[PDB]
């Protein structure tokens, strides 16, 4: 629960083809919010899932999403799914019962995502 | 870890339109393996996910799948996804990195599923 229990505040889980957008989000989150692109050995307080068409195809990404929710948002963890470049129809059905940020929101969804991260951080010692 | 820590050995998580098949599996599992159709207040050792086209659409089903894996198969729990009436292409990408039973297997996938349940049960006190 300690704000320093993790070395990063938020990391972005993005597919290979979405590299640029991921970085744009990291910059946005920086500007304090410490952020990076999620690595395997990566461990932060919040994990933003850059869910794009590419992310949904890559079987490893999906598995990552699944494990990112394995132990996550149930009030215990912080996982923020950002939906970009996808008709709301293509959206993963399970999202109708979970928190997520629509890319059509203000600042391509970035603002609401930062706010989401920001909120969780405060609940920390 | 006690075989009696749960009242049922296995319950089947099936969509509304797959009611019949679900029951067929329950009968198969019975014939000792205690089994039922998963309810909300349902709690068993193993949970078989009857993943069919219908199950994948129903947003509640997907959420159920997600939560059925939230705390599950990582060596700790027992969740068995059975894929029926779906071209392997439609299969949830995350499955390429997880255990599952193909409906094209012997006994419409039922045999391998019973074996899966059976195996987990023995690892119990």
Author numbering:
A (entry chain A), B (entry chain A): 79 to 109, 128 to 221
What did the published study say regarding this structure?
The most interesting single nucleotide polymorphism (SNP) is S180L in Mal. Heterozygous carriers of this variant are protected against some infectious diseases, including bacteremia, invasive pneumococcal disease, malaria and atopic dermatitis. This hydrophobic patch may play a role in interactions of other binding partners because the S180L mutant is capable of binding normally with MyD88-TIR and TLR4-TIR. The crystals of Valkov et al. were obtained in a solution containing 10–12% PEG 10,000, 5% PEG 3,350, 0.2 M NaCl, 0.1 M Tris-HCl (pH 7.3), and 20 mM DTT and diffracted to 3.0 Å resolution, while the crystals for this study were grown in n-cyclohexyl-2-aminoethanesulfonic acid (CHES) (pH 9.5), 150–300 mM NaCl, 10–20% glycerol and 10 mM DTT and diffracted to 2.4 Å resolution.
Mal, which is also identified as the TIR domain-containing adaptor protein (TIRAP), is essential for the TLR4 and TLR2 signaling pathways. Mal acts as a bridge adaptor to recruit the MyD88 molecule to the activated TLR4 dimer on the plasma membrane. The C-terminus (residues 80–221) of Mal, referred to as Mal-TIR, is the TIR domain and is required for interactions with TLR4, TLR2 and MyD88. The overall structure of Mal-TIR consists of a central five-stranded parallel sheet (βA-βE) surrounded by four helices (αA, αC-αE) on both sides.
